[PDB]
Design an enzyme around this catalytic site. Sequence first.
Site, PDB file in Angstrom:
ATOM      1  CD  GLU A   1       5.442  -3.624  15.353  1.00 49.43           C
ATOM      2  OE1 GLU A   1       6.152  -3.096  16.243  1.00 49.43           O
ATOM      3  OE2 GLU A   1       4.173  -3.503  15.313  1.00 49.43           O
TER       4      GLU A   1
ATOM      5  CD  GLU B   1       2.241   9.962  -0.883  1.00 52.65           C
ATOM      6  OE1 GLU B   1       2.731   9.796   0.252  1.00 52.65           O
ATOM      7  OE2 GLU B   1       2.699   9.371  -1.888  1.00 52.65           O
TER       8      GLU B   1
ATOM      9  NE  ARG C   1       2.965   1.094  -5.691  1.00 49.07           N
ATOM     10  CZ  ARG C   1       2.684   1.697  -4.539  1.00 49.07           C
ATOM     11  NH1 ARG C   1       2.288   0.984  -3.492  1.00 49.07           N
ATOM     12  NH2 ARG C   1       2.790   3.015  -4.430  1.00 49.07           N
TER      13      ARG C   1
ATOM     14  CE  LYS D   1       4.933   1.393  -0.412  1.00 47.58           C
ATOM     15  NZ  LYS D   1       5.942   2.546  -0.283  1.00 47.58           N
TER      16      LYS D   1
ATOM     17  CG  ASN E   1      -2.286   0.634   0.939  1.00 43.77           C
ATOM     18  OD1 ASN E   1      -2.485   1.291  -0.093  1.00 43.77           O
ATOM     19  ND2 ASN E   1      -3.238   0.426   1.860  1.00 43.77           N
TER      20      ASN E   1
ATOM     21  CE1 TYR F   1      -1.800  11.089  -4.318  1.00 43.48           C
ATOM     22  CE2 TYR F   1      -3.997  10.266  -3.797  1.00 43.48           C
ATOM     23  CZ  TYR F   1      -2.639  10.034  -3.962  1.00 43.48           C
ATOM     24  OH  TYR F   1      -2.132   8.753  -3.784  1.00 43.48           O
TER      25      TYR F   1
ATOM     26  NE  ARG G   1       5.892   8.911   0.729  1.00 44.69           N
ATOM     27  CZ  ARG G   1       5.395   7.836   0.121  1.00 44.69           C
ATOM     28  NH1 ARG G   1       6.149   6.749  -0.029  1.00 44.69           N
ATOM     29  NH2 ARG G   1       4.149   7.847  -0.345  1.00 44.69           N
TER      30      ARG G   1
ATOM     31  CD  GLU H   1       5.284   3.683  -7.954  1.00 48.37           C
ATOM     32  OE1 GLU H   1       5.328   4.663  -7.170  1.00 48.37           O
ATOM     33  OE2 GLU H   1       4.250   3.015  -8.158  1.00 48.37           O
TER      34      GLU H   1
ATOM     35  CB  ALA I   1       3.569  -0.470   2.580  1.00 53.64           C
TER      36      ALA I   1
HETATM   37  N1  LIG Z   1      -0.890   3.420 -10.165  1.00 50.66           N
HETATM   38  C1  LIG Z   1      -0.585   4.292  -9.153  1.00 50.66           C
HETATM   39  C2  LIG Z   1       0.633   4.389  -8.661  1.00 50.66           C
HETATM   40  C3  LIG Z   1       0.891   5.255  -7.703  1.00 50.66           C
HETATM   41  N2  LIG Z   1      -0.050   6.055  -7.185  1.00 50.66           N
HETATM   42  C4  LIG Z   1       0.246   7.044  -6.126  1.00 50.66           C
HETATM   43  C5  LIG Z   1       0.047   6.700  -4.689  1.00 50.66           C
HETATM   44  C6  LIG Z   1       1.180   7.525  -4.015  1.00 50.66           C
HETATM   45  O1  LIG Z   1       0.649   8.793  -3.568  1.00 50.66           O
HETATM   46  C7  LIG Z   1       2.283   7.772  -5.094  1.00 50.66           C
HETATM   47  C8  LIG Z   1       3.483   6.894  -4.845  1.00 50.66           C
HETATM   48  O2  LIG Z   1       3.444   5.698  -5.611  1.00 50.66           O
HETATM   49  O3  LIG Z   1       1.644   7.471  -6.319  1.00 50.66           O
HETATM   50  C9  LIG Z   1      -1.293   5.943  -7.683  1.00 50.66           C
HETATM   51  O4  LIG Z   1      -2.299   6.618  -7.300  1.00 50.66           O
HETATM   52  N3  LIG Z   1      -1.591   5.044  -8.692  1.00 50.66           N
END
Ligand SMILES: Nc1ccn([C@H]2C[C@H](O)[C@@H](CO)O2)c(=O)n1
Lengths: 221, 212
Positions: A206, A163, A94, A15, A10, A52, A158, A34, A13
Amino acid sequence: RIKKISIEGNIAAGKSTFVNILKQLCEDWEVVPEPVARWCNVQSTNVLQMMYEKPERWSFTFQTYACLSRIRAQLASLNGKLKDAEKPVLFFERSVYSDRYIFASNLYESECMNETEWTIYQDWHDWMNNQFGQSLELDGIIYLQATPETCLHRIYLRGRNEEQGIPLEYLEKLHYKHESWLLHRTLKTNFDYLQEVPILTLDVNEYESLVEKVKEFLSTL
Amino acid sequence: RIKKISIEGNIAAGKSTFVNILKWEVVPEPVARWCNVQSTNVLQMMYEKPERWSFTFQTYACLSRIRAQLASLNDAEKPVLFFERSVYSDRYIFASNLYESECMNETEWTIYQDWHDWMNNQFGQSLELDGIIYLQATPETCLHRIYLRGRNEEQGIPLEYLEKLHYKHESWLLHRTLKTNFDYLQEVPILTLDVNEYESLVEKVKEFLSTL
Ligand SMILES: Nc1ccn([C@H]2C[C@H](O)[C@@H](CO)O2)c(=O)n1
Ligand SMILES: Nc1ccn([C@H]2C[C@H](O)[C@@H](CO)O2)c(=O)n1
Ligand SMILES: [Ca+2]
């Protein structure tokens, strides 16, 4: 010829923090993060932020862009170094699956994409992978499991400006798709091979006992 | 190994009516799939609210075009394939104009081009044109032919619109002053035919394809 693993999880998380720890282990291990940087820099504009702030307007656009870029970046790294190493392992941050069956998909199940958009998206996504995607077939998947409450709290840690508006209910819907896909494996996709792919689930709620399981995993591949 | 020609022209200039007389195979514009995306008309959606669906429509439009043309030429003695408009007219005429009309912000237009460039840098070289037929017509004529064809969505198009498209056409096919990111086109032959007004066109056409 090259073992391709995907790191799933998620938002926030962990990553990337996991990805990095991995890089420092085998010189034959490379990673492909990414293109998040591009997402945030499209001619002095933030298309991630744009989504967003008004999801029902830029969700489609953002998800199209996001996947396109991901395919390019990954297609690129598998034609680079490590293409000579004895034990070539490539970790993906991812994949084009999480992109369609988790993030995009959820946006459609939230009216943040009408039938027109969602239809086009899948049409597009299918084609993209029916061409230069077979080289990107995964050989395994690492699942970084964490509670939506932890991800929310790690969002502040972060401190990414865009976000910081994400509500729990959001991480909760993404968290479910994750479980339903790589845990119970009840979720189905159009790419059938995935049903045969090995999933390593790690509890990251954790810092060396994870490296442990990881190796045992890559060997049984 | 296959001669690929592209038929260009403004909206309602007579692209299809010409394509049919020619039929040698032809690859019609994906107008069908454009009007039918899960019981919705994405073409209609764009004309009704251009500043919201222009990007989406232009992305879809070109994608589909590449697919249709790619499977098209994928074996005779004199293999000639006619394309109804190309990925060029798509980007340097229609899409482009939409951006010059605020119907696309910097974000969209930037992404479009990035995408468009990549798309043709892969499975596009097989689609390199060997020539172009230009169907020239006055915007006033295209406007009047819009009613003759009576397509519900197009019935709102004002002259000022057609006129713009018209200039992008002249600039690109008659004046040869619109540079693109595909240099080979500068070497490609253009046959301009005045279609403002039915066998004297077939005449020039043949002489053209021979000199290819
Ligand atoms: N297919 C994706 C990949 C990433 N993100 C977003 C979620 C996080 O805010 C940021 C980091 O991967 O990108 C998203 O909405 N959709
Ligand atoms: N890239 C394209 C191609 C075509 N059209 C429109 C003009 C006509 O109304 C219809 C048929 O070509 O589609 C468009 O807006 N953008
Ligand atoms: Ca910036």
